[PDB]
Structure formats: C-alpha cells, structure tokens
Design an enzyme around this catalytic site. Sequence first.
Site, short mmCIF file in Angstrom:
data_model
loop_
_atom_site.label_atom_id
_atom_site.label_comp_id
_atom_site.label_asym_id
_atom_site.label_seq_id
_atom_site.Cartn_x
_atom_site.Cartn_y
_atom_site.Cartn_z
N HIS A 131 -7.90 -5.65 0.48
CA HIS A 131 -6.67 -4.88 0.60
C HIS A 131 -5.95 -5.19 1.91
CE1 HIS A 131 -4.04 -1.43 -0.24
NE2 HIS A 131 -4.21 -1.06 1.02
N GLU B 170 -9.27 -5.32 -3.89
CA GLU B 170 -8.63 -4.15 -3.28
C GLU B 170 -9.64 -3.11 -2.78
OE1 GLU B 170 -5.59 -3.93 -2.69
OE2 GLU B 170 -4.40 -5.02 -4.20
N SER C 262 0.85 -1.20 0.00
CA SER C 262 0.00 0.00 0.00
C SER C 262 0.89 1.24 0.00
CB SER C 262 -0.99 -0.12 1.16
OG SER C 262 -2.14 0.67 0.91
O1 LIG Z 1 -7.84 2.60 8.07
C1 LIG Z 1 -7.47 2.83 6.67
C2 LIG Z 1 -8.74 2.70 5.71
N1 LIG Z 1 -9.02 4.05 5.06
C3 LIG Z 1 -10.15 4.84 5.79
C4 LIG Z 1 -9.61 6.09 6.58
C5 LIG Z 1 -10.63 6.82 7.61
C6 LIG Z 1 -9.43 5.92 8.17
C7 LIG Z 1 -6.40 1.74 6.38
C8 LIG Z 1 -6.34 0.64 7.59
C9 LIG Z 1 -7.06 -0.68 7.15
C10 LIG Z 1 -8.44 -0.87 7.43
C11 LIG Z 1 -9.13 -2.03 6.99
C12 LIG Z 1 -8.47 -3.02 6.24
C13 LIG Z 1 -7.10 -2.85 5.92
C14 LIG Z 1 -6.40 -1.68 6.37
N2 LIG Z 1 -5.03 2.39 6.14
C15 LIG Z 1 -4.79 3.74 5.24
C16 LIG Z 1 -5.23 5.14 5.77
C17 LIG Z 1 -5.31 5.66 7.10
C18 LIG Z 1 -5.67 7.02 7.32
C19 LIG Z 1 -5.90 7.88 6.19
C20 LIG Z 1 -5.79 7.36 4.86
C21 LIG Z 1 -5.45 6.01 4.61
C22 LIG Z 1 -5.27 5.21 3.30
C23 LIG Z 1 -5.38 5.60 1.91
C24 LIG Z 1 -5.16 4.66 0.84
C25 LIG Z 1 -4.80 3.30 1.16
C26 LIG Z 1 -4.68 2.90 2.55
C27 LIG Z 1 -4.94 3.83 3.62
#
Ligand SMILES: O[C@H](CNCC1CC1)[C@H](Cc1ccccc1)NC1c2ccccc2-c2ccccc21
Length: 526
Positions: free
Chosen positions: A435, A322, A195
Amino acid sequence: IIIATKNGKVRGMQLTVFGGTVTAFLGIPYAQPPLGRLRFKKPQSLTKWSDIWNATKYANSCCQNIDQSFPGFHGSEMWNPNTDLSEDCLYLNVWIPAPKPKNATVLIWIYGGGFQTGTSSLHVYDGKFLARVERVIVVSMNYRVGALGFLALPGNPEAPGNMGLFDQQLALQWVQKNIAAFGGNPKSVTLFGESAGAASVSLHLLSPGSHSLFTRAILQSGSFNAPWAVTSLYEARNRTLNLAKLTGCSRENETEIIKCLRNKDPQEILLNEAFVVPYGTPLSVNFGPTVDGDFLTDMPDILLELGQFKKTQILVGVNKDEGTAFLVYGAPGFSKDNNSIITRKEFQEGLKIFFPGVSEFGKESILFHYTDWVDDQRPENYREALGDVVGDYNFICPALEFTKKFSEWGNNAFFYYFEHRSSKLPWPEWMGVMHGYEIEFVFGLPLERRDQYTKAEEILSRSIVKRWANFAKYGNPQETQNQSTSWPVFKSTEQKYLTLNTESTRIMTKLRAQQCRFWTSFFPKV
Ligand SMILES: O[C@H](CNCC1CC1)[C@H](Cc1ccccc1)NC1c2ccccc2-c2ccccc21
Ligand SMILES: *[C@@H]1O[C@H](CO[C@@H]2O[C@@H](C)[C@@H](O)[C@@H](O)[C@@H]2O)[C@@H](O[C@@H]2O[C@H](CO)[C@@H](O)[C@H](O)[C@H]2NC(C)=O)[C@H](O)[C@H]1NC(C)=O
Ligand SMILES: *[C@@H]1O[C@H](CO[C@@H]2O[C@@H](C)[C@@H](O)[C@@H](O)[C@@H]2O)[C@@H](O[C@@H]2O[C@H](CO)[C@@H](O)[C@H](O)[C@H]2NC(C)=O)[C@H](O)[C@H]1NC(C)=O
Ligand SMILES: *[C@@H]1O[C@H](CO[C@@H]2O[C@@H](C)[C@@H](O)[C@@H](O)[C@@H]2O)[C@@H](O[C@@H]2O[C@H](CO)[C@@H](O)[C@H](O)[C@H]2NC(C)=O)[C@H](O)[C@H]1NC(C)=O
Ligand SMILES: *[C@@H]1O[C@H](CO[C@@H]2O[C@@H](C)[C@@H](O)[C@@H](O)[C@@H]2O)[C@@H](O)[C@H](O)[C@H]1NC(C)=O
Ligand SMILES: CC(=O)N[C@H]1[C@H]([C@H](O)[C@H](O)CO)O[C@@](O)(C(=O)O)C[C@@H]1O
Ligand SMILES: *[C@@H]1O[C@H](CO)[C@@H](O)[C@H](O)[C@H]1NC(C)=O
Ligand SMILES: *[C@@H]1O[C@H](CO)[C@@H](O)[C@H](O)[C@H]1NC(C)=O
C-alpha cells in the site's frame, strides 16, 4: 518570477530538473488560518494582501499524531510530516513548467493518511518531475485531518463535519480563480489522490459543490465505499461526546462544548483522539467524512447505486499487496524483521484484531473463504491469507465495486493492477507490493537517474507518467508511441484491467472475482 493572483502577488523559485527548469510556488495560503473561534468551522476566504507573498518553501503541516512504531526506519518515517505541525496549515503548492505554459492541463493531488495524517510536502509528492516531463501544472494542498478536520455535530456549524473536505474544496476553487495566471487551464483539471486521498477524490465526484471544479478523476488504492472511509452519524456523535468527556468539556448546550474544546491546546486534543474509538484497529479512522448534509447530502452508497454523481472519466486501481502494511501494526506473530510465518491460531487472533466488532460466525466465514489452500503444506499460507483478507476487504474489492457502479452510468473507466515492488523499498520482501508504493512511480522519481532505481523502473515510471498525463489531458490513458499495450475501458460485463509491471503489461479480466463476491455480496450481511 512574480505572479499576480486574485488576492496579491506571490513570488516563486526556480528549480533545475533534467537540464531544464520548473518554477515552484511552495506554500500559497488559500484560506484564513482556522485558529481561535475559527477552529472546527468551515474554511473562510482570504483577505487581500498588498506585499509580495514569498512562496519559496513548504508551509506548516496540519496538526496530527505521528506514527511512532518504527523510530528511525525510513519505511515508516517517509510518511511522517516534514514541516512544523501547526493549526495554521491551509496552504497549497504549484509547479509550473518553464517556459510558462499557455493553457496547460492541471493535476491536483490529494494525499492520504487515514484522514488523520498526511502532508503535501512529502518527498514522494514532489510535482516538479511531472511539470518538467509532461508539461502539466501540478497543485497540492494541505487540509485539516483528525478531529480538527472532521469532528462532527451534525447540523451545528460550529463543528459541522467534513471541514478537511471543504479545505480541499476551497483549494479546488483557488485553482479555478487563479491558475490561468500561472498558465493553467481551469477547464482541464484532473484530481488524483491515494488511499484516503483517493476516497476524497471519489467524494468530490459525489459532492454537488465540487462538480464544476474539476474535469476528471484518478483514484489510487482508495474509494469512499471502503469500510474505513465514512464515519456514521451514530459513531460521529459517540466519538465527539467521548472526546468532550476526555477533555473535561462535557456540557449540555451543544455549542458550549465546542467553545470548551476551542480553549484546549492542539496537543490535548490529539492525545485524546486515540481513545474515542472503543476498539481500534490499524485501519481505524477516528474522525473522517460524515453525511453532513452539506458536502454530502445522503449516504454515498445510495448516491453511487442510483447514479447521483459527476459524469466523467475515471482512472482507478490498486496494488497487489495492499493489506500487508497493516499486519505489522498489530497482528500477532508479524514483524518487518522476520518472515512472519504465522500459525492457524495466530491467523484467527489476527481476525479479532482487524474485525473487532464482528461475530464469531462472521470471523469463521472469513477463515473459511481464505483457508482453502491451493497447497495446505506451505508455511506462509496463513501469513499470506491475512494480508489478502485485509487488502481485499479494505481496498481491492471496494475499488472494483466503485468502478463497476460508476461505469454502469455510461462513462469510460480504466482499471489498473500495480504489481511492481520498488527496488528501493525498505520494508521486507514478504510484504510484497505494498500500500502506497506506486506513488513513487506516478510522480516520476525513478526518472531521476541519480537515485538507486533500476533502468527497468525508469521505463515503467516513464510510461505510467505518460499514461496519467494522457488521461488528464485527453481522458484516455494510452501510451501511443512505444508500441505499448492498449489500456481497454472497464466494462461491467467484461471487467478488463491493465497490469503494470516492469516485464510484461497484459490485459486480464475480473480481478479477485472469488474473493470480492464474498466481501461484496455475503460479508455485508453479517
Ligand atoms: O501509518 C498508517 C498505517 N496504519 C496504522 C495506524 C496506527 C498508525 C499509514 C502510514 C503508512 C505506513 C506504512 C506504509 C504506508 C503508509 N497511514 C493511514 C493512517 C494513519 C493513522 C490512523 C489511520 C490510518 C489509515 C487507515 C486506512 C488506510 C491508511 C491509513
Ligand atoms: C484554453 O483552452 C480552452 C479550451 O480547453 C478545452 O477545455 C475543455 C472543453 C476540455 O474538455 C478540452 O476539450 C480542452 O482542453 C479555451 O477555452 C475557451 O474559452 C472561451 C472563453 O475564454 C470560451 O468562449 C470558449 O468556448 C472556450 N473554448 C472551448 C473549446 O471550450 C481557451 O480559449 C484557452 N485559452 C488560451 C489558449 O489562452
Ligand atoms: C459509545 O461510548 C461509550 C463510552 O465510551 C467510553 O468512554 C470514552 C471516554 C472512551 O474512553 C471509550 O474508550 C470508553 O469505552 C462506550 O461504552 C463503553 O464501552 C466499554 C467497553 O465497550 C466499557 O468498558 C465502558 O464502561 C463503556 N462506557 C460507557 C459510558 O458506556 C460505547 O461502547 C461506545 N460505542 C457504542 C457502540 O455504544
Ligand atoms: C517474528 O517476530 C515476532 C515479534 O517478536 C519481536 O520481533 C522478533 C524479531 C524478536 O526481536 C522478538 O524479541 C520481538 O519481541 C515473533 O513473535 C513473538 O513470538 C514469541 C514466541 O512465539 C511470543 O512470545 C511473542 O509474544 C511474539 N511477539 C509478538 C507477537 O509481538 C515471531 O515469533 C517471529 N517469527 C519468526 C518466524 O521469526
Ligand atoms: C521575500 O523575498 C524577497 C527576496 O528574497 C530572495 O529570495 C529569498 C528565498 C532569500 O534567499 C532572499 O535572500 C532573496 O533576496 C526579500 O527581499 C523580502 O524581504 C522577502 N519578504 C519577506 C516578508 O520574507
Ligand atoms: C533490524 C534491521 O534493520 N534489520 C535488517 C533490515 C530490515 O529487517 C529490512 O530492511 C526490513 O525492515 O534489512 C536487511 O536484512 C537487508 O536485507 O537490508 C539488513 C538489516 O539487518
Ligand atoms: C445555548 O443553546 C442555544 C440553542 O439551544 C443557543 O442559541 C445559545 O447560544 C447557547 N448558549 C450560548 C451561551 O451560546
Ligand atoms: C520511448 O522510448 C525512448 C527510447 O527509445 C525513450 O527515450 C522515451 O522516453 C520512451 N517514451 C515513453 C513515453 O515511454
């Protein structure tokens, strides 16, 4: 076991892994803590210490906001930090095989989290299985995220931008200077990340200051040309100024603002990071990489297109679903606790959520390309379409395009398509092969027979781990022994890729061809 490094002795601890032993060094510092006047500046070099640094537990994670959408749910909370948050967070970890190796290939992990979150201490990043099973050395580092790691006033060294990338880079430097003492080969270093971690890896292939710090690269579900991966010099300024206004730090001396923001507690700065973007999306990257003129000398799409990058082998891939993880962080009608059958009107409102600043016509065109139904009566039609839209636009098509561009300059490239849904995956079944949920298999957790993984998943992790190690060691991700399917190189004409799953591993061609022509040719016009 104590190891002398260039700045002092560090003490490790001994792990028991599969009737064998891995030696773990957890929490080695690799830079001056970026506190006080050092906040927002580039990472600074460490002064020697004379004692024995006790590197026997994970260190502090970097300050960051926490995902609070699903309190108590393991599917979200497995990604939240599991050590104290602190600005004092510039540390790294080393897993070395026991007995100490002679000249082992090194694998360096760069975590993701949107450049706003993440930490190397996560359970799914435990490098002890890789050290044990494949005799590689595994290294991972914490790097600054959010505004503290990517706030940008271009040209101003008080906040030049890309600090978190320079954090990663200082850590790569530490491996060059020190890993030989741990029995590692500085001349066989493979970076891998997922990612935003993967997009970071891709930017280390572009940054000239990184070229001599690694051999090869592996990019899991991410690349710099993804639409969320780079903030413009425009938006970086508008975002910096908005932060200054939110904190009451609006000045006119561009430096007198950084001074002002340096007197704020980390908590005030994290509070206000959310509202610097006028319209956020689940994929918003409030503070990410910029064209700083230091780490990144030009807009990366130009460097990619004109072949200005490290010439070496890459391993790139994506997961089947994804896009679905993001649907339940905002889209109307979606829930992890029901099957999320949405209507046409719900779909349309969902595009407004994921494409806020896009024209009426731009959104109609997404609708048009993705609602020509192979069956127009299926109730999941819109639910599946929205996930595919988010996934193809945000991950799958940019990664294919990076691989095509990169391989056009002579280097071997290998592309995979991960389509196994973890048997322990806590999210619901309609979200599919989400993802981030290949990471378990890359790190060899299903090899732990104690867990609840099936035997099929043990075998599939067993081959992925072998392929990754053979890529790191030999630039060729084959499993040469258990009559495995041979992984062909990705050529821009043929576009062959390998599918990874528990049943049958096959060679296919031109993944998501119709979808990616829309996103990569047409949609950029609107
Ligand atoms: O909790 C983010 C999911 N997003 C939503 C934003 C509101 C928190 C992710 C963690 C995760 C959750 C579920 C399954 C797998 C992983 N981790 C990031 C992230 C954190 C904060 C702001 C933007 C982003 C972003 C942007 C693109 C790709 C991945 C992510
Ligand atoms: C450690 O191994 C290296 C050779 O590893 C190679 O490095 C890259 C070229 C990679 O692409 C792979 O081919 C290999 O994994 C040895 O490096 C030598 O170092 C000396 C100076 O110390 C130098 O003069 C030689 O030219 C290097 N040899 C090569 C082939 O580059 C090194 O000796 C090994 N150290 C050990 C075993 O302790
Ligand atoms: C560039 O910045 C301005 C200012 O942002 C506002 O103030 C911040 C502290 C934060 O709270 C943001 O959410 C605010 O929006 C943006 O202009 C604002 O736009 C909104 C709606 O788009 C409007 O309601 C506000 O009144 C506007 N305020 C000002 C001062 O113009 C602007 O949209 C940002 N982006 C661009 C591309 O210009
Ligand atoms: C799936 O759930 C969504 C979300 O609603 C929440 O989750 C449910 C499981 C239940 O616990 C609700 O009380 C929660 O609020 C449903 O979306 C809602 O739909 C109603 C009427 O259609 C609407 O008034 C709400 O605004 C919606 N909430 C949203 C969009 O957040 C959805 O209808 C459920 N779908 C199925 C097929 O069960
Ligand atoms: C560093 O650690 C030394 C040895 O610690 C041993 O292992 C740790 C994990 C503890 O379980 C401890 O009881 C063991 O003796 C200590 O002797 C030394 O004081 C430590 N120094 C600092 C600065 O923490
Ligand atoms: C609110 C809640 O926890 N609901 C249910 C969970 C989740 O909905 C999913 O695991 C995805 O979140 O899953 C079950 O249905 C299941 O089959 O184990 C049991 C449980 O009642
Ligand atoms: C004000 O800005 C100038 C550059 O324009 C800078 O040299 C000076 O140091 C700033 N003021 C203070 C108090 O630092
Ligand atoms: C190959 O198969 C054997 C079992 O016959 C297994 O123990 C071994 O781990 C497998 N190796 C790989 C690389 O999959």
